Design a protein around this ligand. Sequence first.
Ligand SMILES: CN(C)C[C@H]1CC[C@H](N2C(=O)NCc3cnc4ccc(-c5cc(Cl)c(O)c(Cl)c5)cc4c32)CC1
Length: 319
Amino acid sequence: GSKDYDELLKYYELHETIGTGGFAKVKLACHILTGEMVAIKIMDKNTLGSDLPRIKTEIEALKNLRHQHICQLYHVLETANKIFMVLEYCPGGELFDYIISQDRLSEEETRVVFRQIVSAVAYVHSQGYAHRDLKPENLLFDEYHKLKLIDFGLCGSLAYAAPELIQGKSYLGSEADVWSMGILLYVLMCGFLPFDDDNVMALYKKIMRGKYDVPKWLSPSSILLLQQMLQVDPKKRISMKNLLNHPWIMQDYNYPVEWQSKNPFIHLDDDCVTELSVHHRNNRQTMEDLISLWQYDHLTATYLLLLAKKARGKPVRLR
Ligand SMILES: CN(C)C[C@H]1CC[C@H](N2C(=O)NCc3cnc4ccc(-c5cc(Cl)c(O)c(Cl)c5)cc4c32)CC1
């Protein structure tokens, strides 16, 4: 109802719907106080049904994941019938779009993108999580052409799922993510899937078999990294630690993947704390302690959006 939007519309101006993926809608919106554009995931609690616990799973995970290549959660607002998630806006489109418009990426272009994927996923695993749904549709570009991983509903698409997922057997989520990243690496450099079939049963068999075509344009180093990631035996898959400084990964770079987060939880920006304090009528030390609770209310949304507004070189001012 209109009651479900009262608190929301005190903080954001709604623009057009930019996507109806899954069972939720995502709208473009503008944070009134800072002017920064955000994405708002709208969910109807009476409609989510049994997919509703997975929404709590994604929120709890997003509250615990803060990293330059993970879509940032700014604000969680729950009403009587709606759950609102205010997220980092990614106008650059999906990695799916980038691949399909450049029928395939070169090895150099692939390394630029893949190193960001390895960065996000390695950080996810360092926090005790596994994504379990890695796919080009879940990686978006911002306005700086930097990748952002989205959709933590599981902590999946069949062509990216590891064979042990297909059989329904037990599995470690981290090893399942490495397989999907191997499928990602193949798609990035070939433009098509390594295992594909119009019939699901035939795709089941092709995945579990593990054999795939190796196009002629793949470098020898690309091939061996692929077979190091696309191992049917999950215990023979390359680990994440070995991926961070893998020879292929480091070609043209000569430094391992910077997987650790730079967006902190501890340190606060004094310019942002100052601008916030002179806008809520309370002393600065109280404003500093309130921000540090990280409730993902309007306060933390305003802080991190003002933080991002500052990084863009815009004046660190409110409204
Ligand atoms: C079908 N799913 C699996 C893949 C689709 C999902 C919608 C995407 N999307 C658009 O519809 N237009 C552009 C666009 C721009 N900024 C976005 C910012 C955040 C999110 C976001 C973040 C999280 Cl954490 C999350 O859970 C969800 Cl659902 C969305 C989506 C955005 C977006 C496109 C890929």
